[model samples]
Target: DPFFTRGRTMLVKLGLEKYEKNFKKGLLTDPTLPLLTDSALKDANIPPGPRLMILDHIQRDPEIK
Candidate 1:
């Protein structure tokens, strides 16, 4: 998986798809925080599968909050 490939950061994929200005901006600056919090997902209204995929990638990181 690209998550394991370790090239592009999660923010890149989110920037390409989510396209929410604040979401992208927040994650870009504070990736160390819990990304699945309701705050992160709030107003984003991200679909289920995509949201899960993002969580899976976040779990793999193991380097941040």
Candidate 2:
């Protein structure tokens, strides 16, 4: 499932591979994906656009919620 996917792989699938480093720097790994929040993403230095897309994807993933 996508929930178990690596952060870098998820970002690539989302066409947000540029933020893979940001996710790594923030320790946003596979296990941490389901726990992500807007504020946490912001604290991770993810910009508004990417944060929105990430959150949206997470919300749509029934397995994650």
Candidate 3:
């Protein structure tokens, strides 16, 4: 239950909450956040700008790292 809760929180803070469906479809949940790559996001149909922002957040997040 609430599998995507953490993911949703992160996306909301990033103003990328609209892509939650896309992330779910791609199985890009919180556990997968730190493992995300450019190609992976691309495969999920996430645009370049959002991809950069997401990756940056992941990289900077001590908890995620």
Candidate 4:
């Protein structure tokens, strides 16, 4: 369970407290904020299990791994 082991620990160090103070909400569950979704990525318009491989690869360094 990465959520129990890694995710919880990672969030604490990654500034959950600051986000709690600033946003007045939990960072883990709800990022109840605005986000930009490409037309191609919108669910209901297209099923979700599909990959956004192009979007995932965009701007990310190929050698980063």
3 against 4, candidate with superior TM-score: 3
Model 1 is weakest, by summed lDDT over 10 consecutive residues, at 1-10
The lDDT of each candidate is 0.49, 0.79, 0.88, 0.29
- Give the TM-scores of the predictions, in the order they appear: 0.45, 0.79, 0.90, 0.22
Query: Which ranges of candidate 4 are over 4 A from the true structure?
Result: 1-3, 17-65
| RMSD (Å) per prediction | 6.7, 3.4, 1.3, 11.8
- Clashes (candidate 1): 0
In model 3, what are the clashing residue pairs, if there are any? Answer: none
Q: Give per-residue CA lDDT, model 4, range 1-65, as digits (tens).
A: 33233322333544332222222222322222222134523431322322143234322423212
Candidate 1 lDDT, 1-65, residue by residue in tens: 32222213565655434434444544533433344654455446655655566667676766445
Please identify model 2 stretches exceeding 4 Å from their true place.
1-5, 62-65
Error in Å for residue 53 of model 4: 22
Question: Model 1 segments beyond 4 Å from truth?
Answer: 1-8, 13-16, 20-35, 38-43
Error (Å) of candidate 2 at residue 4 is 9.2
Q: Write the per-residue lDDT of candidate 3 for residues 1-65, one digit (tens) a residue.
A: 28778778889889999989989999987789889999999999999999999999899878674
lDDT of 2 by residue, 26-54 (tens): 87778888789999899989999999999
Q: What TM-score does structure 1 among the candidates reach?
A: 0.45
For TM-score, the strongest prediction is 3
Rank list by TM-score: 3, 2, 1, 4
